[model samples]
Target chain A: GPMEIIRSNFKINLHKVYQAIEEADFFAIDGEFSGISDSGFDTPEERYQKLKKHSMDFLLFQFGLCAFKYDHTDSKHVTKSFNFYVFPKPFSRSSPDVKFVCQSSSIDFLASQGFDFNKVFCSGIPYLNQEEERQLREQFDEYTKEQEELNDAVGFSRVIHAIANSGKLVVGHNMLLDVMHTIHQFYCPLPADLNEFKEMAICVFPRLLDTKLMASTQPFKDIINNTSLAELEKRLKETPFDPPKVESAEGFPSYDQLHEAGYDAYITGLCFISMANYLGSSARSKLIEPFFNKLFLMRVMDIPYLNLEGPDLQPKRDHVLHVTFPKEWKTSDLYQLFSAFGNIQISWIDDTSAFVSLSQPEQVQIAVNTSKYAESYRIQTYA
Target chain B: GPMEIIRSNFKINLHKVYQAIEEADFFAIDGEFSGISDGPSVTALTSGFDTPEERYQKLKKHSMDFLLFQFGLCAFKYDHTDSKHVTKSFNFYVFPKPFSRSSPDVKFVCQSSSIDFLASQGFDFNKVFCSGIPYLNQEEERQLRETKEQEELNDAVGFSRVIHAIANSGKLVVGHNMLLDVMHTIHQFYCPLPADLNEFKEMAICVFPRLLDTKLMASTQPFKDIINNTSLAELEKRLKETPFDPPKVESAEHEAGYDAYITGLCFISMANYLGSKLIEPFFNKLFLMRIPYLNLEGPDLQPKRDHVLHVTFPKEWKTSDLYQLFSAFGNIQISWIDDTSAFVSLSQPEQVQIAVNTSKYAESYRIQTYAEY
Candidate 1:
């Protein structure tokens, strides 16, 4: 059985969840959205704008939060995991009418993973911000003399409010989108400026930990080749590092569904604890300080991660070159040209251009000086 | 179990469906769309208008905005020995599955109310999205094949091939309140809708020569008084006690397949009641207009509008104010245009003369005959 919270039982389960948040030492979170579009390939500012626009257009269908509380006497952690189904269902004509897009591929993928759309639509809890709730109250007050019951208006966002109010450590894996969607849906709409968004995010959560960034960098970076959440968990288990004794709290059931928000959140929690313990068995706060407030960037070649407290990590791209060739040339041609230099990966820009990354940094100079194929192609160092 | 077709089995089951269409006397169809209106007020605004052309223009724009999620087809052929009709029903979950890069990425809007209603009625969204069959129009199919070598064109055509087969058979097509279904089917599967309403009528008739809307049949002649409400579900319930017996078919309520089967059932009983020879007048007519029906073959019905009146009032006036103002004449129906105006229809036709004398409320409002407006 899964600990699921939907519209029908959300009110009754609210207090218990609030108490769990207050008692927990740290929290892990994940989200299942309706769809995702490819962000434009440009500067991080343009990418953030595209992502922000898409996040506003699409709906968040499910959210998973797992809270872990350490018991000092037994040196064990008890976990309480809850999966919430979220939908924007207007209470009346005066309520906010939400129109969202669902990418066909994304929905098909979710269906393949046994996501119950009927449950999400029929029984999912509704959410609105404080501003919308105030407007709703005013609209209802104007139409009738009697007061309308407005207590349950917040719905699923109450969980987000409690988590933010707790000011405890929030952990996620490759959680940039998860953080953006959460802030936009539950809090105010995301600020247009990326720096403003970063400031607001840090102010709300205070200490945010990204497990994927931890696994990708430092002492564990050499050990874990694949930084995917599940893959990282499997890799950590094979090493000498041992995870803490964590058990599901009373009345909470264990989860086995992979893509499910709650199960992934719980797995993320386990990975974070294992990596933290491997860094240091004691003084965990000092061991994880350097990694705080930094979120991992995936598929972004030049920038390893985004820093919330300061500027992002700027990595050198001397080993990467952007190559432009004739329309007749294909990937095999580019591979042959760069294969003589070192092991390379090519990311296609269009019909005739690609960004080539060389594994051996020293081969960049020789590869740039090669003049045999200069007439048909052009190569430049990637900034 | 009833026949259910999806992306996984659509290819294997398509030939049998084509044969079923060719072997049938007539066919009935129904569609479950992702939504009915672009917005909540579109229905009210469109219904307030009088002309069929205006309604068509409004719905044509709406049909392009929403997606058709499911289509149900039931083919019926009369049995000589049993003296009863036999039916083959198919429920198809229709979605756009782009098989190649050249295929268009389909985007559609879903009304929250419609999605919630469908879920409440036990619609299986999982099956629809995960395995729903794809479709491409004739133009799209041709363009797709021309772009690259296609060994099997069946995947490109998908569900529209069934529509083409039915159109090619030239058999009678029946439906219940099928104006929107016909419009959506032709636009989505056959081709884009024509600009002019007359052109659309000619095109529709060319594809479906003997189209019949059972809703119109139920609202006319011997069935008129017997069947009060012409909604498909209500008509089916009322027709159960009739002398004419329709053939039995396995089905469920609200499902497109079951609704199609029910449409065929109602058509059979009604046609029998009217006698097959007398049913010729009902052919090629769709039922959504102020008049008797919208004639697909020729000119439409032009009913007199003596009982209807146009009213203009103060901006503060509400529907209740109109009801009070017209209470002395007779019971009336008000179709609001905006804050200050509406079209009011009197229940008692002869009272139009008395209702036009609006001197009492004329200080703040005015009323005129429908023609004057």
Candidate 2:
């Protein structure tokens, strides 16, 4: 039921891809990788730094791309979703061999899901990122201009370039990590600086939107109880609104059928369209206005979102302070203890420790300065 | 058919294992490891050059660095009624299972060619990753034993059960080029190999006192002339014609199970030459590790002289150049290890002087006597 595409067979449908890229108004993407290591971290910056170190040990195994083009006659969106399974097939001996880590638990889960490992090892496509593409160009002096172009468009490169060059909006689900991995795997290495990351990202897909953050904001947040693709899709279907329907152009499997990269990309497109269509005619400008380059930042206590138009989201740590109390004490006890300091939000760390943010910003100084004299708790300013 | 043992089906057949060990006269073992690294020096008949202690160091160093993933054994039970040996062979796929959620990850090396070859022969990588049997060296078992007593023993120590039973049974253990195999088995399953070779021999002796090597057996006397072919497949063909009865063991080259079975047949065919009466000198020799104690064969015996020297030369030099360079030092025998190194033995004891006085050639080639090697 899935439409499988590989670099080895890309020549057959080269024209089809070009047409799809030129006509599509927007693209939705998702990726599957060897593994994502869980290095417990509370801050988004710590998580990204951990990923920078750990994600190097893993390679992207698959990528899915769905294109949405409007139909003038039916007033519906025509969709085509493609799943490309890739393995690192070296272009030359000089290219460094790709070594990746596999979590046994992750592999065990995939095997149980009927993922065809044999096919992956046997027929998967090869890819080269921008850094690798540069190396090949410099090393192989004998390579012709046409040859360089061929090597550049080898595997996942064609799909990535099509989306970047399409002059269309790009959309994904809570896609900060997805965008980081996509750029790192298919385009180039992510810059060390977050500002460089923003500049580099905007240069490629000039307009990007994260549907997860969009669903969390304003008018949609009131209606959507959960932002998970499946849950949001279910709720949107039951509600009275301009519910979007995604129809595949060919006899390909639809998103409602299975859980996989292609299906995920397909559903992500539906979710974005449903959210956009609810806003009606002014939707296009509004989607471009507030949501254009915003990426969701999970577990970032100081900022709700990372605004790409500005320097970066700065922390508002004036009101928040970390507290360590007796292990037996509960959240209710924490509220009662901080009762003199005004309303507080407790981000529990463990049985005894938590981050307490006072509703009144000025009260943070009173809480910290007074807590040392108090008998029950110890408090310090949070970074 | 050999018992196809995987993690999922190992428990049901484990009882059969205990019975097999109890009934067997001797056990033959072999293993398929991920790879064997080429150490600094790998000349033939290392026994002649190295002391048993030195050889043990080399073996211990190699085994500790590499992982042995497949182990095969055939329990040979001598039937006095028919004067024949019946065999049951087993091949085990071994992988290190983490002892705990926080157990350090098992990071072992895999030579690309080695994996490619194994895969070419229908090696099921998924089965190895998912369902390969777990094993614990004695040190690991001791640590785990303190945490969980016998309730969850079998899964924790997978193929070690078969090895332990065979060792404790006091039956003779046999294999071809078995010294290395013994070292790896003990290091990976029984206990970490001891630093001293004597301590290793003592530990190995206490488990299975009797040991035999078919490779060593074929290196001696009339059988040595008959069995010039030493590989299991080649030796299997030649052993069929020998006066000693050769069993009809199936051939599955490179798969440890069939290789172990054939090794048993090779040992039996050669054993008939000397009778059930053991070769006293060759008893614990296994292969070459016991050579310092007893020298019984051609390869085992080098001329008992101090004329030999280990030398290092420039890479451009060839055997002819070595011969030409040593011609001035009188007739010398050169065992060329590589273009850059060799073993040069003096024909006449006085030639050591002529070798030392060659200062003009001294800058080009460096020489060390056997004492230094």
Candidate 3:
């Protein structure tokens, strides 16, 4: 079982965590937030703004860190996992009073998964951001006017700082929001500029690897169809991919809680090790270099992932068409207009407009030429 | 013991509550909210000079952000044989848990100060979040019906149904310092508050016509001089020396059920002091700031603002500077607007005229009366 850390045992367990991180080669991190809201399809800038607003609005209730160290003689990886319940508790008058949002569905879902809300609210460890820590230091210094009596009261952010300071590679699965929230909550507020955010994120954790991105590209793409964390772990356990032996360290025991942050982080580490070992087997040993620092995007169509090292991959939308129909028109009406183009998927924008992706890309010209309602409805190729 | 109601036993206890409200002569209510305001400093800065209408608007805005996490109702039924009041109180843990995806998403704010205060007071947050009964408003119910079905919706509107039972009973509703309680109860359970203050008052009176605020009662003639602090805890402490027989009730300091029970006890003592016939004047009145009680039957008290003055001074000036300047006139009260601006009021009305003419700081700093502003 992963060590369960709450407010009462936080200080004592923190020392062990420091020792584990110092001795580890790399670590995997995951976060369970209070809520999540939908960010509809839009431009990259618009998407970033929506996500920034969401991450700032909600609270991260739990954080998981699993540090893995390879044993040279045993030829296996030993892992020490920790699950921390986090809340913004004002330690003194100088501490900030945090205001956060929670979605009803998120709460219900977590409760159904046996998330102990009582432990979270009653005994969750408190956290402070960089600005909050600075302001608190100023207040304490003004009152004491002496450096000898001052003590650090920073909470879970200390673990984040340790991970960043160690300069070891950090792995996560589908980690765009996770990275954004970690930086925004633990370090400081996210920068409004996307490029600035990317630069800041890369500087904090220099070598970040995403298992979801690796599973989606090249050699693994043909084999692993379902890229979900649990599904990927299950699929990689089978066939030509040989996973290295991983075992829990002395104090840490294996657990089966799927949605618990620590368990997910442990699973993510397993998936990463499996993929890394497979890539190391053949002449493609150095191929894992390209997947570094790329965080996967889930709902975005044209953009596959956000590249932290350089510019993102820009794919084309030539196979899609944008159409504007009458107010009373529905999905069936749009289908009638593009029926000759074979089956199409309609992403409705409003009552009068939608983006139609064609199943048969070769018949685009034939459908455009044979269109009957072209004069009534405005249709153009998606740019 | 005050009956505890949570998600597991809410339905069964709700029936007992409905029967209690029906059989009682009157009921006392209190609420524990997720928060009162953003901060105490913000409340002091914004609230000193506000009129009742302005105060209602501020509360209306706040009702949108904060949540009433707990509600307590103590129904007092007069026992003829014992010549005493018997109490049945229910303490409900309320949270808006949406029933399905079609249900309206419930969102509210929690101030850290409020959470910390609740924790310090031994409020069980585990009970509140894990097993708190859910609620829904008319709009939320309508949205649910548009997608699915009411038995499930009725169960989802768990705590609000009791609020409806209280409203429909038409018994006198009693409380201590209950302006916020009334507003939150009506807005959260009944309907969204009307835009206008007068309309809100009308809606409030129409729902439960007979209302009494024990805080207002304690501030009146026979008890005014004897009670220095009108808070429910202080009233409970002081009312022990009174002549009337104290009613026995099972009971915490800030727990809503205990506060409601104390409010009911205070009302009984004060009512006996005034006798039966003279208590009519105290009915339908609510306690407001430093004024006569707000009359729910008629228009609110519109006190003259002549004693108040708005002043704008230099940035370097502090409260001591303003006090030094205004102390020459009379004992004064100050409400700061910013570093340079404030609203000041004097105890002596004649001192205003004296200060307008004789003040030496008037030339250095800008000072004007309320009418001038």
Candidate number with greatest TM-score: 3
CA lDDT, every model vs. true structure: 0.78, 0.68, 0.76
Better of 1 and 2 by DockQ: 1
Q: After superposition, how far is residue B190 of candidate 3 from its true place, in Å?
A: 2.5
Candidate 3 runs further than 4 Å off: A38-41, A142-152, A256-258, A282-286, A320-383, B38-41, B44-46, B146-150, B243-245, B248-254, B289-295, B310-327, B330-343, B353-373
The DockQ for candidate 1, computed on C-alphas, is 0.36
Ranking 1 against 3 by DockQ, winner = 3
Tens digit per residue, CA lDDT, model 2, A1-383: 44787655766765677787688888788877656662212344565676677664555667778878888778788898887777665554444444455554455445555565544444567677877776766665553467745553356676677778876888888787777877887788877767677787886788888888877766865555556778777766666556765568876655544466767878887888887877664224654468888887654445556666656555567767777778878556877788897655455555577776687778888877777688767887744
Ten-residue segment with the worst summed lDDT in candidate 2 chain A?
A: A38-47
Docking class of 2: incorrect
lDDT of 1 by residue, B48-76 (tens): 64677777787877656667879999998
Which of candidates 2 and 3 is the stronger one according to lDDT? 3
Clashes of 1: 0
Question: Which lDDT value does model 1 have at B339?
Answer: 58
lDDT of 3 by residue, B1-373 (tens): 3788989898866778888898888899999987766544454424566777777787777545677888988988887776767788878988877777566666666776777678778788766766778888867766666534446777977787888788788888998988888888888887889998888878888778888999888887778788888878888778877554566543211689878888888888887666645777877787775455665576876676878877776889888888888767667888777657888898866666766766554556876776663
Judged by lDDT relative to the true structure, which candidate is superior, 1 or 2?
1
Model 3: iRMSD? 2.2
Q: Which stretches of candidate 2 lie over 4 Å from their true place?
A: A4-33, A38-49, A62-72, A75-85, A88-99, A122-243, A254-383, B28-73, B81-84, B91-112, B133-167, B170-246, B250-259, B262-373
